[PDB]
Amino acid sequence: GVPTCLLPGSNQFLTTDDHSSAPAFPDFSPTPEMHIPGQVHSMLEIVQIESMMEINNVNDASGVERLRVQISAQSDMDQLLFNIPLDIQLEGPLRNTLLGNISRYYTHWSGSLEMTFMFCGSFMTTGKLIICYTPPGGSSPTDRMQAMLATHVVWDFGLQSSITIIIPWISGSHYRMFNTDAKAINANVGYVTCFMQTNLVAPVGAADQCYIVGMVAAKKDFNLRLMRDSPDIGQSAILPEQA
Amino acid sequence: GVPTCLLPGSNQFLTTDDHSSAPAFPDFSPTPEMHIPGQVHSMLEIVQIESMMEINNVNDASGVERLRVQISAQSDMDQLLFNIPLDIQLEGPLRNTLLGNISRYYTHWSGSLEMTFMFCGSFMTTGKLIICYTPPGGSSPTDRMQAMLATHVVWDFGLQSSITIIIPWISGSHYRMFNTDAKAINANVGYVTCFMQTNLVAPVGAADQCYIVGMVAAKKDFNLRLMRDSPDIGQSAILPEQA
Amino acid sequence: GVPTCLLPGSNQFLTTDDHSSAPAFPDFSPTPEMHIPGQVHSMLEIVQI
Amino acid sequence: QINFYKDSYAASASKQDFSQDPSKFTEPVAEA
Amino acid sequence: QINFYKDSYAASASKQDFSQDPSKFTEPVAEA
Amino acid sequence: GEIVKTVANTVESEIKAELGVIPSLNAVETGATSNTEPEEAIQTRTVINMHGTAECLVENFLGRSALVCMRSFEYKNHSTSTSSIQKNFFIWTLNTRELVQIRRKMELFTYLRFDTEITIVPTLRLFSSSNVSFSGLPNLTLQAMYVPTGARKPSSQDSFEWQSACNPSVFFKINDPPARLTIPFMSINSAYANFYDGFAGFEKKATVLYGINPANTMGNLCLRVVNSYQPVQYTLTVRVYMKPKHIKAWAPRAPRTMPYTNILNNNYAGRSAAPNAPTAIVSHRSTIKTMPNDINL
Amino acid sequence: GEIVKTVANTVESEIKAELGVIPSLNAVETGATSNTEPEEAIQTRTVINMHGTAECLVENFLGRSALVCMRSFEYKNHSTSTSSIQKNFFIWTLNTRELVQIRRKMELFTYLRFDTEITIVPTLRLFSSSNVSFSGLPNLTLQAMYVPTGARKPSSQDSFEWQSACNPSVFFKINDPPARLTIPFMSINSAYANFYDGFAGFEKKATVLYGINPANTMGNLCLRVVNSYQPVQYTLTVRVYMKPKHIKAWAPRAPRTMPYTNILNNNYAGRSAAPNAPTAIVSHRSTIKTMPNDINL
Amino acid sequence: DRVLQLKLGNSSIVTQEAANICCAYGEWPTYLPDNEAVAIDKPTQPETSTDRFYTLKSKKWESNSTGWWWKLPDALNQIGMFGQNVQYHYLYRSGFLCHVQCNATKFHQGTLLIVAIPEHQIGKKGTGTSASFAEVMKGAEGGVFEQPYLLDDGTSLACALVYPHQWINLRTNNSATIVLPWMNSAPMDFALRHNNWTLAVIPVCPLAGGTGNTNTYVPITISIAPMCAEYNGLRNAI
Amino acid sequence: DRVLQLKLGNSSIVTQEAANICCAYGEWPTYLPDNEAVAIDKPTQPETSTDRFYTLKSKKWESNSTGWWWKLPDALNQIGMFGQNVQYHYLYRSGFLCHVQCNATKFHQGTLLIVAIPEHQIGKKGTGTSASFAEVMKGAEGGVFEQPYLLDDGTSLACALVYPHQWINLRTNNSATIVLPWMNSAPMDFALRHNNWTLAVIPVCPLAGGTGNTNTYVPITISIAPMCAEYNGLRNAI
Secondary structure, eight states: OOOEEEOTTSSOOOTTOOOOOOBSSTTOOOOOOOOOSOEEOBGGGTTTSOEEOOTTOOTTOOGGGGGEEEEEOOSSSSOEEEEEEOOSSSSSTTTSSHHHHHHTTBSEEESOEEEEEEEOSOTTOEEEEEEEEEOSSSOOOOSHHHHTTSEEEEEEOSSSOEEEEEEOOOOSSSOEEOOSOTTSTTTOOOEEEEEEEEEEEOOTTSOSEEEEEEEEEEOTTOEEOOBOOOSSOOOSSOOOSOO | OEEEEEOTTSSOEETTOOOOOOBSSTTOOOOOOOOOSOEEOBGGGTTTSOEEOOTTOOTTOOGGGGGEEEEEOOSSSSOEEEEEEOOSSSSSTTTSSHHHHHHTTBSEEESOEEEEEEEOSOTTOEEEEEEEEEOSSSOOOOSHHHHTTSEEEEEEOSSSOEEEEEEOOOOSSSOEEOOSOTTBTTTOOOEEEEEEEEEEEOOTTSOSEEEEEEEEEEOTTOEEOOBOOOSSOOOSSOOOSOO | OEEEOOOTTSSOEETTOOOOOOOSSTTOOOOOOOOOSOOOOOGGGTTTO | OOOSSSOGGGSOOOOOOOEEOTHHHHOOBSOO | OOOSSSOGGGSOOOOOOOEEOTHHHHOOBSOO | OEEOSBOOOBOOOOOOOOTTOOTTEEOGGGSOOOOOOHHHHSOBOOBOOOOBOGGGBHHHHHOSOEEEEEEEEEESOOOOSSOOOOOOEEEEEOOSOSSHHHHHHHSSEEEEEEEEEEEEEEEOOOOOOSSOOOOOOOOOEEEEEEEOTTSOOOOSTTOGGGGOSSSOEEEEESSSOOEEEEEOOOOSSSSEESOOOBBSSSOOSTTSOBTOOGGGOOOEEEEEEOSOOOSSOEEEEEEEEEEEEEEEEEEEOOOOOSOOOOSSOOOBOOOSSSSSBTTBSSOOOSOTTOOTTOOOO | OEEOSBOOOBOOOOOOOOTTOOTTEEOGGGSOOOOOOHHHHSOOOOBOOOOBOGGGBHHHHHOSOEEEEEEEEEESOOOOSSOOOOOOEEEEEOOSOSSHHHHHHHSSEEEEEEEEEEEEEEEOOOOOOSSOOOOOOOOOEEEEEEEOTTSOOOOSTTOGGGGOSSSOEEEEESSSOOEEEEEOOOOSSSSEESOOOBBSBSOOSTTSOBTOOGGGOOOEEEEEEOSOOOSSOEEEEEEEEEEEEEEEEEEEOOOOOSOOOOSSOOOBOOOSSSSSBTTBSSOOOSOTTOOTTOOOO | OOOEEEEETTEEEEESSEEEEEEGGGOOOOOOOGGGOOOOSOOBOOSSSSSSOEEOOOEEOOTTOOOEEEEETGGGTTSHHHHHHHHTEEEEEEEEEEEEEOOOOTTOEEEEEEEEEETOOOOOBTOSSOOOHHHHOOGGGOEEOSOGGGTTTTSOSGGGGGSSEEEEETTTOSEEEEEEOOOSSSSOBOTTTBOOEEEEEEEEEEEEOOTTTTTOOOEEEEEEEEEEEEEEEEOSOO | OOOEEEEETTEEEEESSEEEEEEGGGOOOOOOOGGGOOOOBOOBOOSSSSSSOEEOOOEEOOTTOOOEEEEETGGGTTSHHHHHHHHTEEEEEEEEEEEEEOOOOTTOEEEEEEEEEETOOOOOBTOSSOOOHHHHOOGGGOEEOSOGGGTTTTSOSGGGGGSSEEEEETTTOSEEEEEEOOOSSSSOBOTTTBOOEEEEEEEEEEEEOOTTTTTOOOEEEEEEEEEEEEEEEEOSOO
8 A cells, every 4th residue: 555654643633724524415506606795805804994992981981971982171271081092902992893803813913003083063063182192111191292292183173073093003023912911012002192282162052062982993004913712702601592 | 654644534434425445346247237218317307207296185085085186066156175285394295296205305495396287077077277376475365366366377177188387486595495394484385275267067967076186296497405314214123024 | 744534444354455565575586487388367268168 | 536446336426427308207208 | 725525615725815895894985 | 318417597488378379288198297387387587597406316315325234243152051153243134125214215216226335333332241340342353244145154253154265354343444345236137126026936836925036136244253252241233334336227116105014025004194104195184275384473 | 806915015105284185084974984094194104014914814714613512411321110212312403603702703794605614522431420440431433413404303322313324424433533524505595694683484473583594494413322332321522613614704793792691592681890791891991081001110 | 199090910909089109218119139138049029929919808997996907928928929929938028018998978087097117016015924926916817906095015106107107087088008118127037927017007086977977887998019029048838 | 975866766865964875885786687586486676666765754862862773674564565565575675775864953963873784683681582573573663772882782883883884973964875785695585574684873972952952853764765676476465
């Protein structure tokens, strides 16, 4: 016969193997292919889609109250309104997102993100905001006089309801980590802060209180590398037929 | 030697495998091929052959009485004469057929059927019947005023003894199921009903009572897909040499 | 390595098999062929007698 | 098919025979 | 890919499909 | 004979009220099956159907490995104070009739020609003796010997008929993958006959049985445990699986409805009641106007 | 659709103060995702990026072998003073919903078409009886038989439904490498549906359940110990691993956040508190101005 | 068409109410080809003393008749030079043309299924013992179906339409014709111990009539013609 | 642009504050191709008696409203010749154009997410029993979200933007239009037992106004047009 030696890793089962296997139903004719809308070829197509962040992830907020940040006319100036921890891996606003959910099936990532903030006030409510992305290295800014030193976009309300700030890929390494440690140089992305630029101004007939909805998505330079079981879903027993 | 790794599913016995195997009788010369009539290449050749349905599958009918539906002159009009459950999988008229027996070795099916009904009365017995196929969704019709709204053929007796109604393939899915549940959307085919169109009329010298023989077959669009052990034949012990 | 699956009837001994097998005496030179009368190639030659 | 033995009958299945003539059974009549 | 069996569905993975059209989901608007 | 890989396509049809053209009518008395088209009985649309037919081919319908035999014997010392014969072997006369699924599939055809593939699957167990530790399952060497008709049979484990100098024999172990080999088409005729309307002998007596086919004198499989008896018991069960190859089938059949009662004939006792009773094959419904599974809303 | 093996390169951009050009502004109400480029929102440099995208392809994201079932049964003599039935077998109705990782990955898409690869991994142990020496693990022969819907099931180890003349069955041993085979795409439809907004029956009653897909009547896997019972006990655990192949996915989904409570529906009870509570999916922070992981120096 | 004439040797059958000619499996009896032959001895091909219509005894069609079967060549093994070529020869090969006759008035109703079954092995009800030689070999007399609904077998009459078949529906038809080729796994056979075609006549719908036409004497007649008959192994008569 | 007119059959909808037209997954409803068809019977394509705007009942937008969903084709299964082609036919196929209307003053604020979810299987909270027929099939009346934050499912509203969606932000928009193709694994479906698109209207930001503009009566109106509708399996009405 043909001489043969059986190498290590011969008889085993590697869940990531890729081989042909015996067909149980020989000559089976599967149902003809049919055009169905929305065919997905890559998961990078999905993370490119906007999805809301739970910026108001606070105890007092329940349900849809968590998807909208609440903005009011200020009696002060230069005031911080809200922040966003860019920790995808940890329990933060970006977790419950397409970017967050899908990326969390992976361990490494790279690429620019976009945050889009849509103003949900009155046509009569005007205002200017400054949204700043601060690369890592220090505290999260609390003063607009420092946040503006970083990447920022001033957002004037108007007929265009939304503003996009790009969170540029600013990393020493080609990739970052979905690590349990937020403060590791390989994992942290920085901070996104929002300050008042002038104020929120609404006339008497309009509400003084307004909502901003934040959505995040990946850009076309986004990459996800090392696959893993998602920590979001868990199990302690085989799911039964009745609860 | 040649490096080799032994994949999962190596040493096993899959009853549907397809490989060459050692010849026990080397250089054996089998008996020469000889022309025998009726060579079969596909089982779709067989289900295309007509075969009687046990339409009169009732307790009071024994044997050949079950293969013939009994038709009489009516004193009423528009009356239902008989129905046919199209449930191949379940115990119905179509089970004990070539279509039924052979298809029951399979789990999925598709294609049009034909029912042929042959009048076995007198040359003097005239009449018109309306045979209706009702797609699924509701009750089986009991009134000709509804059955005619579905697929139907009016059948006038004459020198041509038989009528064919095509049960068209009307399904959302490419295939249906030989499922234990008759009322599942994947399994049910509808209903076939027969009503009087005018009446059965026979002169005094001829019998007032007449027989119709129903036969069913598949058409050339018929397909059977997933193979299975037939539920029709069973066994509790190895068949002995003496009963 | 080369992927491989071991089919049924792999490790067995079928007395009618027909394969090459390891030579125990490598490079052995068998005695030269010599013409001997009455060479038989088939058993149908014998039943004809 | 595929075969690793001399004998033709040792070969694998021959499943490439898609011919059909139901007329042998559905129209076995001399005159059409 | 690679296959040692007749049936096409027995074959190994088909991982050479690098097409992307996110516009189906990111710009699903009639007018650009 | 046309080639049919995919089922027929459907052609578009329009209204039709022509005289002299009656496609839905036909004459069953000719022995012919209705040639009525869906297109001329109803109004149809154009359907390009790509559904395959490969899986109704007789090569696939029959070309599946099926159990044809299952024999067990006790692997022990059968020698007593009188006889020395060892009996850790069984002899099986080959047939496709001991198990009904394979039997009925291939009684769907009058004549079959097929080279057949046999796979032997042995399984051991330890017999529950009065006091025996389950000390594991030995890797015994089994010998399956094909004994063609007219050859002398082994009547013992130690018999010298087991040389298998001429008889084909396969040696395999418990732990090894199941034994396999291909038996050719061996009928003295051009095909196996699943049914034989006649007698296999030239004599008229009662001992010449009806339905026995002389060409189906198919020989025997003798299987032995080559290892001699252990101190303790084992029950060896051998399942033989048989797979027709290169099938060629003739003259389809009326499918069996009654249960099989034996392998020597096709006699039947039937069910007590429907389904599959002699007087009632299909189960009952109250009336011909009754829907057992009527959809109620 | 353009080909994307490597992620987008970045182009160099300069200062810009043009009127009528507002790239960072956009209209979310259109349903469209922001098309703002990094190049026109900030000043960028030229970056030639060679990072691959192969490992986010759905073939790789889904094409990993995942546990879908884990059944165990006691391999022993189940015969009592009353019943002879042997029960060293289990029957599993096939589904991708008993284990959450595989379930949720593939509820990320509404419709999937994939030929699936099944690997069966059996493991034995010796049951800790009142008094039993650990006399080793036998090399039992197992039989996994696919029973398509409508076919009769085995209700015993010794049943004759196990012929598997038609049903595909695979025989494998404990010590051999795990059994493997490829099941094709079998839906009567063009794709499997992970979600079905409807009812699988024509009737209205309560017994017709919401979310049950008729096309997902996917049949059953019956697994048996072919070896008959040993004198002593063994607990056979079978893990079935399933690997989609040639996947084709449609209509991505909102990912599951609540735990699964069952396989017949997508109902949820939720966490007591965040994370993954019905009122709070993401865990809390004190205020929208609070950094839980603020860097302190 | 319906009017048909069958001229074989001396014989000539006319029928003015025929359905058609059923050629079993589309074949037409032929003589054994040289490349299919086995027996080397030269065959005898009488061609007119055997290949002719042999009309068997008629059966009375009752309102309760189960059905009749005739086994071939058994039915003809004593009739004419056909039987005397069978008796004097070990080996036999032929095809058969079977013509069944049944007339009734236009006021009568009924339906006969005329089936030619290959290798119709008769299974018997309520016993494990195989059918005896006498219960199977009845010759020109033929046999009667105990269980037409199962074809005196574990099979069904409903699925009997796989076999070469014709009906005699008295509305449409009074005669049925089936052409039977040589149907065997061997190029020949010993005609005295094996039958290859069973011609079965089974009433599916009973013979009935109206007032005054009840209980009419309606016979059923079988005419069988050997076709391309050849015999081999000439020896003494058996 | 923002000004839009939709002319379908009899109907014609104008809106002067529109965002755009959302074509779900970039598709545009088409009739079933011949090579994708399954049912051989000829389909009926009314093209004007069905393919037209059907305006459903209006919902009142409260400051505490959770959201509303309408299931298709269920919502239209009794409205017009569309419903009467569904009732009289076993099989159904169509696309839908959904137009949602909500006006408010420039002094009002609010935001509606208009989502068209395919195969939106409703999971229910605090029970293992599946949703009943009544709680799922509400027709033109539609349903109300118990849990908009989870989409009456174990999923999330944040990630609902995968689905074909538009917003009605009263600053920018008063109407949203989504074009829904045929979204199924089968070329047809039984319209009375399966819904393929769920149109969900969910307030993400509550309706609010300032002094004097509080508690304004702001309705939400749904207009749905079947698109390229075709029916098959003509039978009696169900």
